[model samples]
Target: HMSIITDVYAREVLDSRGNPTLEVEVYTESGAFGRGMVPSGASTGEHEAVELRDGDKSRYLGLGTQKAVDNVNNIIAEAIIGYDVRDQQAIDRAMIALDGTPNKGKLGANAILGVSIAVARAAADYLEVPLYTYLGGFNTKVLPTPMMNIINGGSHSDAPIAFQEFMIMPVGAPTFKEGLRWGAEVFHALKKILKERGLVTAVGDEGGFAPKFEGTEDGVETILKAIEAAGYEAGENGIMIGFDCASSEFYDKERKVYDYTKFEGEGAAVRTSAEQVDYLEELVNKYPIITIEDGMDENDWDGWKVLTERLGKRVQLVGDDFFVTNTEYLARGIKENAANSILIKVNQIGTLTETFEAIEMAKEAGYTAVVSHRSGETEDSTIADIAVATNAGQIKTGSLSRTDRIAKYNQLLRIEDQLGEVAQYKGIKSFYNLKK
Candidate 1:
């Protein structure tokens, strides 16, 4: 008999943000067992897939996941058990259909996602193979370029820094291990630089420095100085700066505007859509930035089209909230000529199958895929395997210090060592095909 799912259950766990999330376990009839955990996001998009939470005000300040846990223990467990673990698509489809809601609002995305991950892991274990090998089949040996977050702002930090993430991407490294080393070195050097400048130098939500700066330019210059102090070149083959603007968190949806006040930037000016485009375009002009994510509000299709037209040809303009790793949203962006790259957050779609589907969607539309991590994370390294499995080209997994962040990079290091001569490192070329 084929290996069938025999049991399913869930537990409440704490995320990096100290919020309670769901963890699931699946057991196969063959006695193979697997476990998975769900990550939470701080700055979420309105139109993205829904993450169900218990609204009981008494628990975790209304951010509880008990309802999701119960759904996994009862409804999902009942519907998915007895299915062949290898038939991941069928199993996932069964859950999707059972929910019957467009966004899986009934059973909860967390509930479904936990089961999805655990099921995939258990199936791979039974097959005696790696998760990447099981998910991608053969010829999946590309080592992703690492985009390590060095400074945190926006929702990731309590400081007044405006931008969400100030990251350093190590490109042109001969191996994934070397790239990680370069990033870690820069991160430490940045710490030293911040110390010298009398900044707090403490970490934010994602293990990135959350220093309050005197002005917008101050933050940028601090990083530039750090890169130089660390003995690394900026925007060269070895290293480049990237930003997760996460601008939607500060966008004024009603006016189709960017309120610098809410973002706590210098001058606090309200920029119109066109002006916002000009400002970001000017940012790339001034800095050695190689990528910008979520530079506009999620609903600013018109502005996105303009931003892509203006800056898409220069560097990687990634859609985070714009796409939210959803098939429908990616399709709409593809049709409209939106951003040139899509940020892949697996939980954003709530399943391994849908996450892969979203990657395929980006591939069809000729956009780069950058697998990502949530600010509220765990020591889970599933995403590292996912990046390798899908040949996503790049990964953004927080900073260098925190165990939760380093776990992903450390897993990548192990994978790279194992991949050896068979693996091809997809360096700077992964970001964009633009001419230098």
Candidate 2:
């Protein structure tokens, strides 16, 4: 089924935020075709790769991605058209060399990721194999634990709680189907609980509740109540609570401070790099939070080291902005004792090759890697297969309400059924040892 690249096309499409995003299509000489799209992140890290936009100030509030589309159609299309479809690494390297930038600032990560994922898909089609099998060969059928985001706050919400996301994980469920079912019920129960308390049930960017609460405790309490209300426990072995602090969004880079006052009023608080770790430790102790993503700023390496030391044994300390799915940052993290886990976004490093490599690196360092989706997602479920292929063991594709969110969960369910008795659910195995 070996085939050379036949054709390539790039176009502008609308993401969930109604902003333009790059979508690419790759064709092989064997008539195998594949299409891919890049999801946009609202709370992006500074060190993350560039998501090129037109900045016209007239189109989608200057968030247009036509420039990225042009880069793909003109620059990338000419670079790797005749390469063999099976040469995934070489194709990605050619694109990387052509860009010749440290962080994909010149060609745009959205353009690069679009083509990278699509080529993988095209090769899989030509080989008559599932995407996961194509990506990982044999022995790549494990289903991942779904770390479902059921409450949204911080930058993802309109009312805006201080924390970015209040997530729920079905760690107690024995199978992928059961985990998804548990998550859906808790999601609905959370809506019910919010409504009964006269709070807003409107979903946020990631299809989770964006309720106006007085403090972070309120949000965590709501998630715990939802778990029990939906007939589940709310601790490490069951439906556990998680958070994506996304602290970089609120971090004042110039001032070297993190201001929590925006969500609250005049009496709201702020913290220094070290103080932030202290606050995170307090939260982890008080709540059933099994994980906290980006607990400190992306550049707060010293704070991250303390965070890992304080809470790494109790809960997952994930580096979202700090790692940004980049192997270089992850390696530095290993050296500095920065974090115990990483949030894997395909667009963060701009390709499946890099993503897989980063995952392998994290595992080698005894850190868990979570495949993730951005707030602005389409009905793209390719990540589900990739997570399974890599045996990442955990995934965060948003909550249960939105179509884009459920598309991935639905894909996992299909994969579980396809695997039948052979598919092993990670379940509680997804988490690390707790000191409690």
Using all chains and alpha carbons, the TM-scores for the candidates as numbered come to: 0.92, 0.90
Clashes (candidate 2): 0
| lDDT value for model 1 | 0.73
lDDT of candidate 2 over 1-436, digit per residue (tens): 3478866778776877576777778888788878876677633445677766778887678888777677668788778865787787888778877888887877777677777778777866556777778878888878888787666777646765676766666777787777777657656666666788787766676776667776676665665666666575666445666787777766887777888775667876788876776666776557556778887777767677567567778778778767777778878878887787788888777777788888777776677788887777775777656787767668877777789877787788787676788888667766642433
Q: What lDDT score is found at residue 416 in candidate 2?
A: 64
Badly placed stretches (over 4 Å) of model 2 are 41-45, 55-63, 249-259, 273-279, 282-287, 432-436
The lDDT for every candidate, in the order shown, is: 0.73, 0.73
| Poorly placed runs, candidate 1 (over 4 Å) | 42-45, 57-59, 283-285
Residue range with the least summed lDDT across 10 consecutive positions in model 2: 427-436
Give the least accurate 10-residue stretch of model 1, judged by summed lDDT: 41-50
